[model samples]
Target: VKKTTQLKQMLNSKDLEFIMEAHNGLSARIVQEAGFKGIWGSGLSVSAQLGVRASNEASWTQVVEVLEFMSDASDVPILLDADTGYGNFNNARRLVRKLEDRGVAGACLEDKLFPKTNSLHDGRAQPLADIEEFALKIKACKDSQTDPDFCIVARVEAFIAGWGLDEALKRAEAYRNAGADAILMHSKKADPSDIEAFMKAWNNQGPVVIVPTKYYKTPTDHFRDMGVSMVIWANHNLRASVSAIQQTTKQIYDDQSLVNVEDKIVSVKEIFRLQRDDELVQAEDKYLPK
Candidate 1:
């Protein structure tokens, strides 16, 4: 009925689920095979290169493909990264509606302006719009979604803007107050201390999701107790994939052969099973009305 209700029911039915972060459909499928219950697609994967502008259509199409793939795999819910709503309130509303129609369980919209430069690497962060404007966008997003429990993550990048902890916490509180279903606090530089602090400040208003790829040394339990309902291992899968491909390519040239290292490569059967082939096979046998 309502977006919040639908989302709550999704979580309730599935229990506390682990989400795998990916940028594309193939990556999402791989995470699915790894036994992750949900997928969190990266918004930057389609747009921006080294924090430069890229086509938004790429993101839209990639999302469509991922949703199609997830649906065929028994409606696996996808939480998309909708960067800065790609514009203002109207743009945010339009994006949310499109995502909802495509069967997204949730989508994240940040409080940054369009053409968002890299938050960490870049000296300046995307300037946020007025709080009331952002609040209106959040309200519009929730209203646009057909499913009551449809996840809407409101990300505030204040910490990345050199605004310090007080502003970050304040913004987070505002986002929660504005009807955001979740909060994503982007780390400014390579700082685990800030992440830890944010986690400490986190109150279980809703899901407090953290991405620790920038600083890998932080312990998970530290944040889990600090009201973190979800942890997204963003960029790890893509980075790992790139590294593996680079190694494999180097080996192919070194040996001048098609031989693949058994240890390095996952088995084809394992891959297929991870893609939910086993689930499909079992469903055919168990639920065909025989």
Candidate 2:
């Protein structure tokens, strides 16, 4: 089946699918092997991987290149985090076309200004785009897609911006009416009250997506019970990786010996497996002029 179709079916299905965050091809493959049904090509994670901040410091082209490697590495569908459509309506349209051509399943765009700040960032006030304007952006994205099943998830940031539930619902309804395939309601609270309120008010008008980064303690079953179609465990892998790398490097520096920390690291053989060494060997055997 086409990846777009697969993504659409997952959204429409009653089961609450868990989409794992992947910063690169290796992480994508690891998540797929770990049994995730889909991958979220997270903008923040990608930015961190490129040694930059999450505030659109990395270009969309850079993100696309990384996602190309991710799509090639994993068999599962990839949902890209296309921040603020990377520009205006025309940019959204162009992004949809480019991502479709690259075999990406879908994209989630927030209703924020260009060079959007990460929602979780503290002490940084962010501004949301005009609802009508953002709706047009969503429409342009939908209109530009060659594949009807290609999803364009409209991410509402009203709650994250402290605009209250009414505004979140208002923006969400507007975007949905404008042809958004799904609604991703983001919240930065440690509690799920805002999300619960949104779900109650939303009342399943369409597919709902939640990124439980702040409220990580909430059980997946609770989201399933709330009628959420998808839950994205966004940024956990990147955070975990940073911790692991930091600790490993610190230990290496303190000990001044690679031997002491070798046991804590993954074997080169496992890395080869993730890189598909066996498949490369077979290809070599078949075409090496034997």
Candidate 3:
């Protein structure tokens, strides 16, 4: 079956699907091994991995390269975070075509201005795009897809911009009317109250997506009970990797030896396993002369 079909099925399934954020091939494989249903090709995580900001500082093509690596490494479908559709309506159409050609299952485009700040970025002003204009972008994305199952998720940032539930619902409904396959209602609040209000007002309009990064303490069941279709554990893997690498490198620098920290790191064998070294060896045996 096509990956797009699989992703659509997962979204429509009764269970609440979990999509983990991954920035590279290895990270994508790790997410699959960790038993996630799908991969979220998060822009913030990818930009951080590339030592850049998430403000479209890295080119859209660069983001596509990372997503290609992700698609190559994992069997599960990838849902790309295509910030502001990389430009206007025409750009959104082109992005849908490119992502579909590369086997991406879906793309989530937020209704924000180009060069958008990350949702987690503090004290930075985020201006939302005009509703009709953003809706046109969503329509363009949907019309450009060759695969009927390729998803175009509309990410509403009203809560992030502190516009309250009313504005969030208005934007989400508008995007749905524009043919978005799902609605990713974002929030930066520490509690689920804002999300709850949004969900209540949203009232099962279409598939609802949530990124529980800020409200991480809330139970998954609560979201499922409220009829959320997908919950993305966005940036957790990247955050964990950063913490581990920082600690390991700092220990090496402070102690001037790898001895103590050796126990804290994964063995080379684990790396080989993640890289499918055994499969490569088998290929060598089959192709090479005795």
Model 3: per-residue Cα lDDT over 1-290, one tens digit each: 88888788888888898899998999999999988879999988999999998888888888888888888898888999998898899988888898888888999999987664455667654568999999999998898899999999999998887687888999999999999989999888899998799889988889989999888989889998999999988898899999999999999999999998889899999999999999999999999999
Question: Where is model 2 poorest over a 10-residue stretch in terms of lDDT?
Answer: 116-125
Q: For model 2, how does the per-residue alpha-carbon lDDT over 186-226 read when each residue is reduced to its tens digit?
A: 98899899999999999899999999888888887999889
Q: State model 1's lDDT.
A: 0.68
TM-scores for every candidate against the unseen true structure: 0.77, 0.95, 0.94
Clashes of 3: 0
lDDT of each: 0.68, 0.91, 0.90
Residue pairs of candidate 2 with colliding backbone atoms: none
Candidate 2 TM-score versus the reference: 0.95
Off by over 4 Å in 3: 116-126
Angstrom error at residue 111, model 2: 0.4
**Model 2: residues with Cα > 4 Å off, grouped in runs:** 116-127
